[PDB]
Design a protein around this ligand. Sequence first.
Ligand SMILES: [K+]
Ligand SMILES: [K+]
Ligand SMILES: [Mg+2]
Ligand SMILES: [Mg+2]
Ligand SMILES: [Mg+2]
Ligand SMILES: [Mg+2]
Ligand SMILES: [Mg+2]
Ligand SMILES: [Mg+2]
Ligand SMILES: [Mg+2]
Ligand SMILES: [Mg+2]
Ligand SMILES: [Mg+2]
Ligand SMILES: [Mg+2]
Ligand SMILES: [Mg+2]
Ligand SMILES: [Mg+2]
Ligand SMILES: [Mg+2]
Ligand SMILES: [Mg+2]
Ligand SMILES: [Mg+2]
Ligand SMILES: [Mg+2]
Ligand SMILES: [Mg+2]
Ligand SMILES: [Mg+2]
Ligand SMILES: [Mg+2]
Ligand SMILES: [Mg+2]
Ligand SMILES: [Mg+2]
Ligand SMILES: [Mg+2]
Ligand SMILES: [Mg+2]
Ligand SMILES: [Mg+2]
Ligand SMILES: [Mg+2]
Ligand SMILES: [Mg+2]
Ligand SMILES: [Mg+2]
Ligand SMILES: [Mg+2]
Ligand SMILES: [Mg+2]
Ligand SMILES: [Mg+2]
Ligand SMILES: [Mg+2]
Ligand SMILES: [Mg+2]
Ligand SMILES: [Mg+2]
Ligand SMILES: [Mg+2]
Ligand SMILES: [Mg+2]
Ligand SMILES: [Mg+2]
Ligand SMILES: [Zn+2]
Lengths: 286, 110, 166, 154, 51
Amino acid sequence: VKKGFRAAFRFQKELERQRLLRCPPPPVRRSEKPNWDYHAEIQAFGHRLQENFSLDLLKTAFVNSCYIKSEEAKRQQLGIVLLNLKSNQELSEQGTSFSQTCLTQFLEDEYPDMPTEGIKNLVDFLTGEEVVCHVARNLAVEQLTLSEEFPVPPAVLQQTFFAVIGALLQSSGPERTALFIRDFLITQMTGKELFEMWKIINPMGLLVEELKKRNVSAPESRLTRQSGGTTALPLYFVGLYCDKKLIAEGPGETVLVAEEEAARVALRKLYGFTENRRPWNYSKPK
Amino acid sequence: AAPKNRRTIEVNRCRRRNPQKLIKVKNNIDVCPECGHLKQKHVLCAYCYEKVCKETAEIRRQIGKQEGGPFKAPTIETVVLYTGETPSEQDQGKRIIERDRKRPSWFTQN
Amino acid sequence: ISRKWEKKNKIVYPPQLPGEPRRPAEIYHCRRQIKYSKDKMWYLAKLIRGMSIDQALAQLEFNDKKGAKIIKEVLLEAQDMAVRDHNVEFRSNLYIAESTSGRGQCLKRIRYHGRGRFGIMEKVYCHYFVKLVEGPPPPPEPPKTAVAHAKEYIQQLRSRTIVHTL
Amino acid sequence: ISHGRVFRRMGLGPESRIHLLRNLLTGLVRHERIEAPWARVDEMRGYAEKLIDYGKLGDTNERAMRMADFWLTEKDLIPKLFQVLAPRYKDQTGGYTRMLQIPNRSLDRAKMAVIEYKGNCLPPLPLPRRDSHLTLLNQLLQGLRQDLRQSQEA
Amino acid sequence: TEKEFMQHARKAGLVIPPEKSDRSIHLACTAGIFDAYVPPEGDARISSLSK
RNA sequence: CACACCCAAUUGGACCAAUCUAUCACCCUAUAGAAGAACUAAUGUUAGUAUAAGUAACAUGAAAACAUUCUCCUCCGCAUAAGCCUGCGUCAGAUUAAAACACUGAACUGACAAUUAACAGCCCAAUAUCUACAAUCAACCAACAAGUCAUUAUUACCCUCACUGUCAACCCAACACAGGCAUGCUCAUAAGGAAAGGUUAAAAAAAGUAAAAGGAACUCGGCAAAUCUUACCCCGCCUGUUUACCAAAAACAUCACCUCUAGCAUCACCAGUAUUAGAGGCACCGCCUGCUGGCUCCACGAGGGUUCAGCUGUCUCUUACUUUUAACCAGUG
RNA sequence: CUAAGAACAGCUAAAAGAGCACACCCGUCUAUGUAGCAAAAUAGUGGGAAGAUUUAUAGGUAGAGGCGACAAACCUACCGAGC
RNA sequence: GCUAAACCUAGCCCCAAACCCACUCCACCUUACUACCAGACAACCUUAGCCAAACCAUUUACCCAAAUAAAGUAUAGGCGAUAG
Ligand SMILES: [K+]
Ligand SMILES: [K+]
Ligand SMILES: [Mg+2]
Ligand SMILES: [Mg+2]
Ligand SMILES: [Mg+2]
Ligand SMILES: [Mg+2]
Ligand SMILES: [Mg+2]
Ligand SMILES: [Mg+2]
Ligand SMILES: [Mg+2]
Ligand SMILES: [Mg+2]
Ligand SMILES: [Mg+2]
Ligand SMILES: [Mg+2]
Ligand SMILES: [Mg+2]
Ligand SMILES: [Mg+2]
Ligand SMILES: [Mg+2]
Ligand SMILES: [Mg+2]
Ligand SMILES: [Mg+2]
Ligand SMILES: [Mg+2]
Ligand SMILES: [Mg+2]
Ligand SMILES: [Mg+2]
Ligand SMILES: [Mg+2]
Ligand SMILES: [Mg+2]
Ligand SMILES: [Mg+2]
Ligand SMILES: [Mg+2]
Ligand SMILES: [Mg+2]
Ligand SMILES: [Mg+2]
Ligand SMILES: [Mg+2]
Ligand SMILES: [Mg+2]
Ligand SMILES: [Mg+2]
Ligand SMILES: [Mg+2]
Ligand SMILES: [Mg+2]
Ligand SMILES: [Mg+2]
Ligand SMILES: [Mg+2]
Ligand SMILES: [Mg+2]
Ligand SMILES: [Mg+2]
Ligand SMILES: [Mg+2]
Ligand SMILES: [Mg+2]
Ligand SMILES: [Mg+2]
Ligand SMILES: [Zn+2]
């Protein structure tokens, strides 16, 4: 037994770290953890995003219907004044309707050749359950959200996120809130292809319909490049020819896959969603 | 000759856990039709062989009480008899060995 | 010394929800201070690893090693314990999940050599650990085939990028 | 190189090999069923079969008496050979003994076997029995045999 | 090389404490009922007949 | 963009882990003081555990009713002495490593029991006084090395059988060690024992047996083995002695010879006296020689060489079989 | 070295530090063994074996020494100077 | 998860203070721990050496009764090492 407290104390802390790794504790809300003030954390929320939020409106944006129902049940167990808290259902409807129309406005102006179904999918993707939740969890939205179950379900988190837009829409107006959608939702399709967000089936069948609307004859698929046909690792470049004019060329391991990819390349050029398209203009409006 | 270097555990595992060193699974095990205990196809049942030796020892103990000493082997056949039995027609002029016990079912009188 | 394996049988789980699937029964049993080499014991524990409870007994019954009789006695008392204490419906349903040997407390004696020399002989002891899980033994992993090899190889050729550039 | 060797190398030498088999043979005649290591039983089995052959020559044969005198250490068993074992196998021309394998002994896990003289008064061994003629495989072969014989007749 | 296991504990009796002791075990409850009670047969029917 | 931030020995600095103390501090800190104040290295010390390695090595004659019987060995056995000190008697044991085993498991633990004197040991009143003549069948004979056994007188004295040793599978060798161990009988046993755990019958290795034709052609050398065998030379006279654990000899000692010293007693020499004693050389004898030196020669030798004949696997030229080992299975390790 | 004891078949021979040859003592040659059964042993082959023999018991000589048929041997398993 | 790993006392060290112990019965210098017979036997005497002097040969510190100082001074010494 060697005299000394500092070494023994330091070893206990190391053991505690190992205990956490072996048996991690269940996750808890940031509110329950020490150094938390709901009034202070929500004031900084507006300043962090550089917006003139309304405290009364924003405090109602994080309140969920499930939270109110569970909170009332807590008082019944103790028999305990009435709460006038308002849920975010009213604000979420305002934000969701405005966001879809604002995204539709932005996408239709940027891509005039994109069909309405194509624009609908992109708005359904940017406002989708995964994109909204990914943006919400990195803006301290889940921390301020008053939910009944932790972690916040993705459906609950998506609805709370649009309530922040609804609170922002009333306080700052539509022009100011339009930049909020562009700076957080439009930037979510930067490194993404057209059909990676708008998943389609049989692009060749969709390509034939598009050329009928433009009075263009059906393309003829021909082999432009070929390599390793008899091997298990071939390379086929099939090209679509309209009136003996190449409109797109697609690669693939086999001929059917290459032709399907060639159709996807043709659709991207028609809709103007190619990789070569000019980037979204994030500069301040003039 | 002494080892030049210590052989590591990684080298040792490849030698110790090699499939040749491992015990080979036996596929010649089947259940005994008589008692249900396990046995091999080419080996007599251990349970059934033990019951024969237990009965054989008792029979051989009765032989010792009749001979009453060594170098007294009989020059006639031997017959083992149990309670409730009489010498047979062919069991004449033989040494009857009495057993105060019921005849075992697997032991067929011949 | 450590006796955690005994304590692994005393953990009680919360009652399962009606929609939750059936939880397999886990039985932890061991025998301590077996007068046997742990290295020799490992071959017997490796043999019955993953086998059924009845299949394991058959292999141990006709095995000539001394530990085969010792391990078989452990399996019989572990099979009895599962039905008697661990609420297992069928005793034969059990299969071997974990079966390993461990070093035990060993003695030290003197082995005399010639020329007045000597060596230190140890009386080796071992521990045997067995875990039983209720339910049929999992099917052995099928050997990797050409289609599995071809699919993996092409995936490697598809995941390669242009390195040391943009 | 051991090609054609039929005799095993046991005991402390060629003479000790004979004495080990002689003790087993003498113990086999007295008890008509003994248990011993499989190799020693198999090596002694040949001598057991030929001992009855000398026993059928009769006790009046001088040569047969000398073989019985040597191979039976206990002299009380010699009258038994010429008056019990030999008359028993009078109709038989071979297969006097049956050799069966038994579980290995716990002492040294040695391959053990039991050898007995047929027709003894001891309880029968649990002999290996083939599948009954009523089994599914035998019935298919039984039906095949009937058709082949019937077609052969016609 | 003369060290050996400390296997020296032996079985003993737990029924009775050491003899010639002033202290004796204090019992708070009796082992069994002093007089066995046998409820009349058919008392289950009487449960319905509360009167 | 940053910038003290790539030399041995040595030298100058700036920081500093942990500890104790003063005062703070109070999830482990501050400023100071003090000191057993920091280890990838000394064939370091102690302890744990690997590697070689589950390797080397170790063990139990057979059948059986576990009554008994069989096979084989016996160069051992029994007793006393000495030594050891309860160390295979009974019972029980959560028992459980004696180099395998083990339930009755047992050469382990605990308890209980035991070896009974006639044998052996433990002896004796005083004072004087006695005791030339071997032993060896002790009779012949023949010795030298000269030897292993005895009382009387007077006085005193007539109480009685205590005490201790007594077991065993045993002692000295670190061990249940192929060793060491006095005497009396048995001289093959009337007593005491078991070389093989099972299997297989590879190499290599050990021991043994047999071999065509040849018979030392092998080899430093007829070493080993076989056979039962002649003639010499060298050295040492001979028996004997020595380097316990690499040298048994030509070395040492040895009768015989020779040199030197000593004229005498109460502890060696010596209870002796120059035909003696001591210190030495040489190695008998015989011959020869000087006034000490050289040859010859009988036997003898696990000395060193040589040789006839025989003998033989030493070899030309190896081969077969058996046993141990071996390899595999089980236990220990 | 002292004291007082013991042992040595049989045969040939003769009153023998004679011969052959057991017990016994010694350790010539070869092989096995080399952390071995053994910090010097085993098997066979050998020298002596009535004597300067072998051996049990007790006592004596102690390290600037003892003892020694001198091998610089031995004096409790490292003696050119014990521990 | 086995083997293990951890622990705080037992006690000890250095001072102060004060000068310590040894007959219950029996046995104990003979072969100690042995009830019980003529002995005559009696104790005292410089330390050396390693080491230093770069060998070694003269020499080379070892509490002798008050801490300090005189003083490492007078002296001693192969007038060297060193001692005092
Ligand atoms: K000689
Ligand atoms: K010097
Ligand atoms: Mg020794
Ligand atoms: Mg063969
Ligand atoms: Mg710079
Ligand atoms: Mg500090
Ligand atoms: Mg230090
Ligand atoms: Mg360290
Ligand atoms: Mg070190
Ligand atoms: Mg090896
Ligand atoms: Mg071996
Ligand atoms: Mg044996
Ligand atoms: Mg007497
Ligand atoms: Mg006997
Ligand atoms: Mg063998
Ligand atoms: Mg063997
Ligand atoms: Mg020849
Ligand atoms: Mg030659
Ligand atoms: Mg020779
Ligand atoms: Mg001589
Ligand atoms: Mg002479
Ligand atoms: Mg001589
Ligand atoms: Mg020598
Ligand atoms: Mg000598
Ligand atoms: Mg020699
Ligand atoms: Mg001389
Ligand atoms: Mg020559
Ligand atoms: Mg010749
Ligand atoms: Mg041949
Ligand atoms: Mg093995
Ligand atoms: Mg003589
Ligand atoms: Mg002689
Ligand atoms: Mg001498
Ligand atoms: Mg000399
Ligand atoms: Mg010299
Ligand atoms: Mg010595
Ligand atoms: Mg000096
Ligand atoms: Mg010098
Ligand atoms: Zn059966």
